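Schema walkthrough. Field components (list of strings):
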Amino acid sequence: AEIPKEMLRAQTNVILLNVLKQGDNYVYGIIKQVKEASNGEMELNEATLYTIFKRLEKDGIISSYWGRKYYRLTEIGHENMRLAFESWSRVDKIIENLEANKKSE
Amino acid sequence: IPKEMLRAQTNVILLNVLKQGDNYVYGIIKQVKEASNGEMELNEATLYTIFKRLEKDGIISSYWGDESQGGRRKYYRLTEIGHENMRLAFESWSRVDKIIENLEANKKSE
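Field assembly_structure (string):
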């Protein structure tokens, strides 16, 4: 009953982007805030954040600066989150229709 | 929309088709086409690519179903492991939504 590793990575990506949507942040603060928001259950480790942030920065989704290193969501990242939400909204409607077409038949 | 994102979405849709009930490839494509109102017309070869991986991982299997109009179709089905993975996905993704809600609430506090 463990969550698949690929799925966990997808979830961790979403959580981190939503933290940075809250505001610019540093790794220690992010990990601490996620721990608080998860009632202590989700304790992310630095190594996973550094891997993820390197990719998000490469894809232009986030940027960084010294101010420890602070991270922020770019305009590209905000737009990408908007398009993802819209695209997954349409998927939710497809699944709803599959269920309704089932019950109808 | 990124190619990876489309693949993740196609995976979830196909698993949800099979959760509704066992089906064969032409039937699956038709049900997705109808449920997307024509917006998603999957090609067979993409399903075979995805189904090869899902069968390798024990998430789906296949069997021959005798058709009452004559002949046979290859049916795909979600396995007991596949059903459990979908249950854990729903629970863990639901929890992610709650964490994000909490991050926002903890934000407004200050």
